[PDB]
């Protein structure tokens, strides 16, 4: 199945069924983070999904086609993290993202803490557009987790 929507990325190599990450299917392309799959091929029931593009520094990878998600944070409005935690249901979490300030510009960042198996969950704008993926960030002084809004480049 290549139906649009959000998917869990599961593995059996360890104890039981374990959720390594989360991904997005859009326009026949599966979008997740690199550290989730480490570029490995994926199975979708009877089919198989092979990586098409990936970048370790961006922590992104696409399957069966180019990166299709092109929306970005307008910067101002609040967004929603469609978190799909391991063993739990997808739930939308509205938040006003912060700012990751780097030498190469500013990127939005949401201060939401979820198990590592939530890596790759999409972040949406008010129109439902995927503006980035969740799962690449830092740990601050009190030790909660703040993830960047990681978005790829279409075309």
């Amino acid at each position: 199945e290549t139906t649009d929507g959000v998917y869990r990325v599961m593995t059996r190599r360890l104890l039981g069924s374990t959720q390594v990450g989360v991904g997005v299917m859009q326009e026949g392309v599966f979008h997740t983070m690199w550290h989730v799959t480490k570029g490995a091929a994926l199975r979708s029931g009877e089919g198989r999904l092979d990586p098409y593009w990936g970048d370790v520094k961006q922590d992104l990878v696409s399957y069966c086609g180019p990166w299709k998600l092109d929306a970005a944070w307008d910067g101002l409005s609040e967004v929603q993290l469609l978190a799909v935690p391991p063993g739990e249901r997808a739930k939308n979490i509205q938040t006003l993202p912060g700012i990751f300030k780097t030498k190469d510009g500013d990127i939005g960042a949401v201060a939401l803490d979820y198990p590592a198996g939530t890596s790759g969950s999409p972040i949406l704008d008010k129109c439902g557009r995927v503006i980035g993926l969740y799962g690449n960030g830092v740990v601050i002084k009190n030790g909660s987790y703040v993830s960047a809004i990681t978005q790829g480049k279409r075309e």
Binding site: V9, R43, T95, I99, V138
Partner: protein, 38 residues
């Protein structure tokens, strides 16, 4: 080997719980893709 299974639709929800602060952080991104605080 890994596999995928659907978890829901990509949709904004108006009855969504609102949480989380909006911190502004100076970070550095290394070649391996790991963020670090400055």
């Amino acid at each position: 080997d890994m596999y995928i299974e659907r978890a829901g639709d990509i949709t904004w929800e108006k009855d969504a719980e609102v949480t989380g602060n909006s911190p502004r952080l100076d970070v550095a991104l290394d070649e391996s893709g790991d963020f670090s605080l400055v």
